[PDB]
Amino acid sequence: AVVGIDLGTTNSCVAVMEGKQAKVLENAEGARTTPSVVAFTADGERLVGMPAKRQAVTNPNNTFYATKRLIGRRYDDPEVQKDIKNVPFKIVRASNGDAWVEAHGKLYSPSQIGAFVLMKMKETAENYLGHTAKNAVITVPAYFNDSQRQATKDAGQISGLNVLRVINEPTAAALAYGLDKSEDKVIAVYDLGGGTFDISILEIQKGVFEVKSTNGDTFLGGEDFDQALLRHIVKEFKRETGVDLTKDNMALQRVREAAEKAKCELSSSVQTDINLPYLTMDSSGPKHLNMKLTRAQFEGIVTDLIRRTIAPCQKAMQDAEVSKSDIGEVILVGGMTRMPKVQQTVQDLFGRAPSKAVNPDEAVAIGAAIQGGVLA
Ligand SMILES: Nc1ncnc2c1ncn2[C@@H]1O[C@H](COP(=O)(O)OP(=O)(O)O)[C@@H](O)[C@H]1O
Numbered sequence: 001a002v003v004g005i006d007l008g009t010t011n012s013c014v015a016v017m018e019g020k021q022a023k024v025l026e027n028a029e030g031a032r033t034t035p036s037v038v039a040f041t042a043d044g045e046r047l048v049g050m051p052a053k054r055q056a057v058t059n060p061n062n063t064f065y066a067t068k069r070l071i072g073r074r075y076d077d078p079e080v081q082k083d084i085k086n087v088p089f090k091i092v093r094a095s096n097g098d099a100w101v102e103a104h105g106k107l108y109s110p111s112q113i114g115a116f117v118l119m120k121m122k123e124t125a126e127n128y129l130g131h132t133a134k135n136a137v138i139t140v141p142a143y144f145n146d147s148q149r150q151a152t153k154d155a156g157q158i159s160g161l162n163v164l165r166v167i168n169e170p171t172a173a174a175l176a177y178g179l180d181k182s183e184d185k186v187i188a189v190y191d192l193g194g195g196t197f198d199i200s201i202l203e204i205q206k207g208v209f210e211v212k213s214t215n216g217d218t219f220l221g222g223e224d225f226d227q228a229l230l231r232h233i234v235k236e237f238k239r240e241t242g243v244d245l246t247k248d249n250m251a252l253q254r255v256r257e258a259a260e261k262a263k264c265e266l267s268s269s270v271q272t273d274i275n276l277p278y279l280t281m282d283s284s285g286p287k288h289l290n291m292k293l294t295r296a297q298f299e300g301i302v303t304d305l306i307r308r309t310i311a312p313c314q315k316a317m318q319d320a321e322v323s324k325s326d327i328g329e330v331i332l333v334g335g336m337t338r339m340p341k342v343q344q345t346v347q348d349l350f351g352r353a354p355s356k357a358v359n360p361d362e363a364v365a366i367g368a369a370i371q372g373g374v375l376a
């Protein structure tokens with residue numbers, strides 16, 4: 001039996017076909033998605049998933065995240081250079097010119113780090129199916145070259161998986177939205193995720209998809225929404241407590257966690273409270289953080305990032321030679337497309353109501369599970 005795995009830059013997701021209905025699998029922590037973050041403790045253990053995410057700010061050296069921008073890429077790649085400036089961990093040049101990483105002295109490869117994620121994903125799949133997980137359908141971005149796709153297949157095979165097929169993420173979401181059975185239509189895939197923004201235009205002819213154009217920003221994702229709110233929260237805390245949280249890593253780690261949760265609640269509620277009891281220790285006394293945040297306050301803080309996804313979408317329509325009246329349906333991928341203002345931009349960008357049929361942070365994995373059941 002074969003599982004579908006979305007190996008995302010920020011969060012990964014595993015799914016397996018259960019008859020004619022797809023099934024997203026919950027990991028050991030009960031989450032339906034696993035953070036694509038690997039860390040090595042000072043004790044020496046290796047942390048994968050949420051146990052590693054809750055430590056990124058406190059232990060920034062021995063924590064690897066967003067390594068998907070490094071996989072299948074040489075050290076002299078522009079994308080590796082830009083990503084090298086935006087990380088606290090060591091990004092080293094491999095012997096063969098590729099880009100590797102180092103933690104506690106020992107070196108690791110992007111395929112090796114990606115395998116650590118896939119180990120827990122297969123461990124999640126095993127805990128369901130029972131026995132062992134041998135076959136797997138893994139997804140990649142449409143813009144991945146040949147060297148990147150082989151490095152992704154490396155990561156699956158290092159974890160012990162047999163990568164049957166390697167489909168594209170925008171094609172995977174199309175299978176999750178059931179457009180596999182349509183006749184003919186031109187589709188736009190709006191993928192705003194944790195670390196990358198991807199806009200893809202797909203054409204379906206008699207049941208076969210075709211990638212017309214590809215654009216977006218690979219450094220524009222949900223992580224930037226988190227940091228903007230974090231920077232705002234820390235500022236309104238120096239104006240109320242006179243303390244800059246940047247000096248307490250544990251405090252900051254708490255803040256990032258609380259900031260993202262605030263953004264997630266604001267997608268279905270217009271107001272939420274951030275209560276961090278006993279955050280920092282001052283000379284005067286233990287300080288606290290109680291903050292009321294509205295959806296309108298947040299939309300204005302991150303309106304710059306939402307607008308920055310608009311130009312790559314229009315450039316994709318001229319490279320695809322399509323217009324607003326040619327695109328038959330728009331589907332949303334990535335958990336960030338749950339933000340109602342991001343949904344409003346998509347509606348004001350293609351003239352149609354965006355399809356909110358599949359969980360955007362689960363659509364890629366569901367589509368890979370569609371491919372798995374067919375290869376069985
Ligand atoms: N309900 C939600 N509302 C707003 N933002 C969300 C919600 N769920 C997840 N997010 C954000 O979207 C991102 C999820 O990305 P994900 O679906 O894992 O795509 P990928 O990891 O493949 O890039 C995370 O950064 C998270 O902060």
Ligand SMILES: [Mg+2]
Nearest residue numbers: 008193334364
């Ligand atoms: Mg994604």
